């Protein structure tokens, strides 16, 4: 029970879900915030909703309404839902350069001012679009100085605390990173928040990696797993969906390329059209990914693996018919005395417009603490716990040591 | 390739972009096609050289396409990727280094192919100046060609030395170049960029 455990008291008639959206005009001088709320329990006419935007202590906009939206089909509409659209003049944009936040409040109240309950979130204005082969944020083409980060503590195993999060966030920035890739599963809830406030682009990933199958395809192609799989993507989406830090979704990791991936990708695209979907399994360029995201592809040298080659990043873009942007999901294995060549990457990134970065692999050393014959500590690894089978050192590819101490 | 070259104008387009020059160019295009169109060796029709890019090229290229869909058209003027070519066909683009000149830069060839939007093959209409002691780096080219599909090779500049024979105080001959004929203005050795001497004896 490695993450928190909690208790929540909710009213009988309550806020079931809500999602924010923000469309903008050509120049961005104007936007609309869209909040859609659903409710649970018993629905009475005297019931209202109030969504209101705040910048600091200042009310930016407010909107009130009763439940029951638009006609959606022949059967009608949703009576337990309401969507509000609030117009905002010259909104302060959110980016990892200036994580401009607003706070948004939702009130479930009754027509006579009585408040049933309230829920909220930090809203951040921004746009993520692939356009013309380029990934744009807020109308500009991103350059992704990113890193793959694991939820790791040499002392607490995979339990996370704000301190550790926050420490990392800081190192990350100090060191010139924009983004984080949640390898390879949803992360502890705070994180998002922090990213929202500190400013980092976040790639959120479904908890799905079937690496050890033969082929890696095995399950991912099997309809029988389609349900199990589905729950791992959908729920992430229902959860993380309103965080501004999240800019792209990932189908999971190293689980080859199965029909299951394709439906879920389409799923996501229907559901939340505001963010690209990415998935690398199956060769980095499948139909299940909006972006070519190989891992370990060289700058200039090709790795012509039968079935699943690793083209030189530079060549990969001009392949016949290709037009998608390239952002490496992993690159630059940073295991112990390493990182030779980092430069090569940066120069290409800098020279090729459609090569908008990547994620170094990785952040920390997956080293664990152990004590000797005197209560003396020391860093433990693969098989140090009589663990079998084991891959020893393969757990130490971080840019910093488990205690957060920099690798040169 | 059509006999149309107005290199020396400022801008290069001055005529190619002048409706009044339409008819003239027109005929250099139309007649070439109508005479040569039956040879199987011709596989690519070109609009001339360095004449910049003008509304007249677009029209003319449209004509070709209309009348002889059997072949692609290509033209390098105005930046090598104009709407008047079916191929990116620059001259002297470097393999790995870019030359971003205003209005008409010269991207690293490998780089050019992925420029957002871009999907056409790339074949150098002129590359590797066989001028004197040259051809260095040659391989660099051969290697890209081979690694990138969309890099279809290219044409060396050029075959023969445009040198001319002259005779001395004793009727013994010698190879003369620009301005050796008291020609002014001229551009000297600039006329000798071949792979083989003007007598068909090869250069190294």
Curated annotation (Swiss-Prot), chain A:
Where along the chain is Mg(2+) 1 bound?
209, 211, 254
The reported result of mutating residue 150 to D/F/L/N is: Less stable to heat than wild-type. Causes significant destabilizations of the first transition state
Top-level taxon in the UniProt lineage: Bacteria
Q: Which residues bind substrate?
A: 254, 330-333, 397
Annotated positions binding Na(+): 394, 397
The record places the active site at 254, 330
Residue positions annotated to bind Mg(2+) 2 are 390
Induction of its expression: By allolactose.
The annotated site for Transition state stabilizer falls at: 150, 184
Quaternary state and partners of this protein? Answer: Homotetramer.
The entry assigns this protein to a family as follows: Belongs to the glycosyl hydrolase 2 family.
Q: What is this protein identified as?
A: Beta-galactosidase
Species annotation = Escherichia coli (strain K12)
Q: Which gene encodes it?
A: lacZ
First-to-last residue of the parent protein present:
209 to 616 of 1024
UniProtKB/Swiss-Prot annotation, chain B:
Q: What is the effect of changing residue 126 to Q?
A: 10000-fold decrease in the beta-galactosidase activity
Query: What does changing residue 129 to E/F/N do?
Result: Poorly reactive with galactosyl substrates. Less stable to heat than wild-type
User: Which residues are catalytic?
Assistant: 50, 126
Residues involved in Mg(2+) 1 binding: 5, 7, 50
- Which residues are Mg(2+) 2-binding? 186
User: For binding substrate, which residues are annotated in this chain's numbering?
Assistant: 50, 126-129, 193
Chain positions recorded as Na(+) binding sites? 190, 193
Q: What induces it?
A: By allolactose.
Assembly = Homotetramer.
Entry similarity comment: Belongs to the glycosyl hydrolase 2 family.
Q: What is this protein called?
A: Beta-galactosidase
Native organism: Escherichia coli (strain K12)
Residues of the whole record sequence present: 413 to 616 of 1024
């Amino acid at each position: 029970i490695f993450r928190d455990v909690s208790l929540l008291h909710k009213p009988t008639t309550q806020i079931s879900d809500f999602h924010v959206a923000t469309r903008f005009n050509d120049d961005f001088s104007r936007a609309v915030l869209e909040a859609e709320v659903q409710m649970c329990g018993e629905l009475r006419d005297y019931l209202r909703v109030t969504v209101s935007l705040w910048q600091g202590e200042t009310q930016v906009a407010s909107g009130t309404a009763p439940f029951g939206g638009e006609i959606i089909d022949e059967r009608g509409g949703y009576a337990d839902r309401v969507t509000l659209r609030l117009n905002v003049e010259n909104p302060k944009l959110w980016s990892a350069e200036i994580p401009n936040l607003y706070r948004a409040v939702v009130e479930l109240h009754t027509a006579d001012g009585t408040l049933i309950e309230a829920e909220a979130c930090d809203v951040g204005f921004r746009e993520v679009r692939i356009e013309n082969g380029l990934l744009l944020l807020n109308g500009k083409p991103l350059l992704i100085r990113g890193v793959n980060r694991h939820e790791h503590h040499p002392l607490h195993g995979q339990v996370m605390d704000e301190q550790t999060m926050v420490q990392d966030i800081l190192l990350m920035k100090q060191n010139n990173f924009n983004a984080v890739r949640c390898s390879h599963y949803p992360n502890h809830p705070l994180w998002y928040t922090l990213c929202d406030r500190y400013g980092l682009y976040v790639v959120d990933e479904a908890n799905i990696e079937t690496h050890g199958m033969v082929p890696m395809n095995r399950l991912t192609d099997d309809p029988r797993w389609l349900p199990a799989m589905s729950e791992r993507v959908t729920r992430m989406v229902q959860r993380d969906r309103n965080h501004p830090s999240v800019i792209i979704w990932s189908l999971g990791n190293e689980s080859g390329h199965g029909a299951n991936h394709d439906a879920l990708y389409r799923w996501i695209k229907s559901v939340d059209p505001s963010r690209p979907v990415q998935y690398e399994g199956g060769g980095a360029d499948t139909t299940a990914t909006d972006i070519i995201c190989p891992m370990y592809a060289r700058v200039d040298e090709d790795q012509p693996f039968p079935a699943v080659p690793k083209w030189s990043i530079k060549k990969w873009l001009s392949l016949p018919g290709e037009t998608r942007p390239l952002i490496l999901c992993e690159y630059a294995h940073a295991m112990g005395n390493s990182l030779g060549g980092f430069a090569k990457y940066w120069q290409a990134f800098r020279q090729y417009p459609r090569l908008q970065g990547g994620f170094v692999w990785d952040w920390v050393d997956q080293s664990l603490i152990k004590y000797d014959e005197n209560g003396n500590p020391w860093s433990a690894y693969g098989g140090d716990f009589g663990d079998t089978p084991n891959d020893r050192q393969f757990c130490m590819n971080g840019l910093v040591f488990a205690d957060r101490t920099p690798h040169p």
